[PDB]
Amino acid sequence: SFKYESAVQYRPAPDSYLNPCPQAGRIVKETYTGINGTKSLNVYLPYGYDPNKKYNIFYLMHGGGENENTIFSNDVKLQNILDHAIMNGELEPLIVVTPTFNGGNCTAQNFYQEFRQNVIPFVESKYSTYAESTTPQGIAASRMHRGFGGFAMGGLTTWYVMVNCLDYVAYFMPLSGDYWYGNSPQDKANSIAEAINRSGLSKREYFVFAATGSEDIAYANMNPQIEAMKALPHFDYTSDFSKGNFYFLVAPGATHWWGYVRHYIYDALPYFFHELEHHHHHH
Numbered sequence: 001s002f003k004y005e006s007a008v009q010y011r012p013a014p015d016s017y018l019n020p021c022p023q024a025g026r027i028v029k030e031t032y033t034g035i036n037g038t039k040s041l042n043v044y045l046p047y048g049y050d051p052n053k054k055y056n057i058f059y060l061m062h063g064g065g066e067n068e069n070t071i072f073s074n075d076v077k078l079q080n081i082l083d084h085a086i087m088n089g090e091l092e093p094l095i096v097v098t099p100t101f102n103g104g105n106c107t108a109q110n111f112y113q114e115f116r117q118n119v120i121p122f123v124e125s126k127y128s129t130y131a132e133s134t135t136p137q138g139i140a141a142s143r144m145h146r147g148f149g150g151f152a153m154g155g156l157t158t159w160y161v162m163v164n165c166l167d168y169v170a171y172f173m174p175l176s177g178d179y180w181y182g183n184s185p186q187d188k189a190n191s192i193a194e195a196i197n198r199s200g201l202s203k204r205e206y207f208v209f210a211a212t213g214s215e216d217i218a219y220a221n222m223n224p225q226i227e228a229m230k231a232l233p234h235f236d237y238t239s240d241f242s243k244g245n246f247y248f249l250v251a252p253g254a255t256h257w258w259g260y261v262r263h264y265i266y267d268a269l270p271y272f273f274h275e276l277e278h279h280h281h282h283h
């Protein structure tokens with residue numbers, strides 16, 4: 001059903017998508033020990049999850065003051081949107097993981113380290129992704145089917161994941177947060193460009209779908225960064241990821257609130273994981 005648009009516009013999920021779907025994915029609370037101690041996360045498994053199939057995986061970080069339970073809590077209800085989108089065929093089934101940057105020495109900035117060493121091997125050894133194994137080689141070999149996103153301070157987390165984890169992750173969804181490395185937007189853009197250079201990847205091998213609200217305070221810092229990134233050769237601006245790799249969706253009137261940001265995920269997540277995919281699909 002899904003077809004890429006070149007300038008996709010903001011559209012909230014129908015109100016009905018905010019209520020429970022009968023085809024409900026299972027949400028599993030997990031606990032693991034890593035470099036920041038013993039911590040928890042939730043794993044959303046799609047309805048019909050079959051461990052003998054391979055699923056895309058999207059890791060999604062909360063904002064400041066929140067935790068690994070927030071996104072599937074009653075304050076957000078993202079699972080209802082996922083369930084309905086997957087049942088209706090708008091979104092291909094995938095695993096969605098909500099970890100936390102709380103605990104131990106962890107911060108929104110440094111979470112990528114724990115992500116690489118602890119979170120990916122824990123989750124992807126248990127559940128069926130494109131990783132045939134969870135050695136560094138096995139994670140890197142499956143990077144086209146792995147994404148990371150997050151809201152606010154979790155948007156900051158996303159940018160640090162991008163800069164430090166291009167080897168492991170191809171799709172990025174920073175929501176209402178900018179990258180804090182640099183004294184100007186050009187410094188931020190240049191850091192990202194240098195990470196890309198170091199990775200050796202082509203422009204067909206990483207994708208950034210950023211979003212915020214036109215009344216969201218984070219726009220002030222995101223917008224200059226996006227414009228600086230658009231000037232790099234590293235990014236081809238368009239939401240058609242069969243043709244380019246960079247988009248910034250700005251929702252008219254929306255403020256810095258999960259009530260809006262959940263809809264950005266609804267709009268953007270369907271755009272992920274079709275480039276070099278293993279099914280024969282026409283988008």
Ligand SMILES: COc1cc(/C=C/C(=O)O)cc(OC)c1O
Pocket residue numbers: 063064152153155156176177178179217218219220221222
């Ligand atoms: C990472 O980028 C951001 C994070 C926050 C966080 C706010 C909070 O935790 O209260 C606010 C921003 O713009 C105003 C922003 O650009």
